[PDB]
Amino acid sequence: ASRYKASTDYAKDAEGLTAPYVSQDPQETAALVRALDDAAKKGKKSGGFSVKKTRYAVASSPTGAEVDSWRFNDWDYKKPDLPTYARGLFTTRTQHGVPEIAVRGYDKFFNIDETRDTAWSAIRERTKGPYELTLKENGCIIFISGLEDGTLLVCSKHSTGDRSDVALSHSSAGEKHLEAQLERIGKTKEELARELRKRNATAVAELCDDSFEEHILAYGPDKAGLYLHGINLNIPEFITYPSPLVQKFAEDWGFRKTGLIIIDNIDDVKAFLEEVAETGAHDGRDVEGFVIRCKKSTNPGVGPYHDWFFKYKFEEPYLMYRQWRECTKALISGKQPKIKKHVKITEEYLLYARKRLAADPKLAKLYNQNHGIIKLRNDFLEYKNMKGTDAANLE
């Protein structure tokens, strides 16, 4: 029962939905900031969860605006009573002195079985549908929101602007894609900034482009850009747009859309995902995973029903691809490649990569920082006349 196809045509059928909207309450915001500030302090006896606070200056801002970036230790999201479970999280102060949340990412979410809420029996017991299955595009996260002075603010996970630590920051690369996107549709940055603040919202995109930072699936000049997969309200709890409205927003401001499947029964979700994982491909395309969005309650009884995510990552051929990338990277340096799984095909792939790497050295260094990764992978894939799925089950 894989006769669910991914679609990016929901947008205009989103006509009957209203996007969630709540205004920020400055007392509760300022209360969150003192909770994070106390977690950011390194000598206390109590308050057992740590945060790192990095302010950031918004270079493009006329008010001289600044934002603080809040980063938790990864394991703290598995503790109860965090002041917020937002992963990316930026606060600021309006030019009229009001404290605000500038950027609110998703709640930290986990893969199946990596926590006890992500066990299949638990998802079947505490969640409620319809389950939204969104394509997990493979890139780097970008946050976009609008400040009170009209500044359009572009963040990566945890950072914004230019840093003395990298050659071109993720957020700058993202901001440059956003500028091209808007001019192509005759809209400007301040209109997007004005819009996102009007919705009290952070836009959540995946930046996917091999010219910048190539991951495990390819994004050429054709595919490159920002894929929109979420809009969240800039408030302490997690309230997110249903995906049809995200697709409508993507269409109104030029983002690439994230594919969506809605499945009503959770047993159909589980049967679906495990069926796609036998090939790692869907509808002719290869896919690293789905993000499943749905509603969950703390304990299945009286009380909550908050928006909740879990990931389903497809386990092959992608582990093989990783091994081929790390083995190719190992063989450019003075280190023997490690072969852990897929021994027979991996030594065939290494056999061929060595022929092409000795032919021109200029391949051999574009692979340190990664050019040619998928190209080298797909070149042998059909040198041997194989889809990566078939190579992965040669064993």
Ligand SMILES: [Mn+2]
């Ligand atoms: Mn990712």
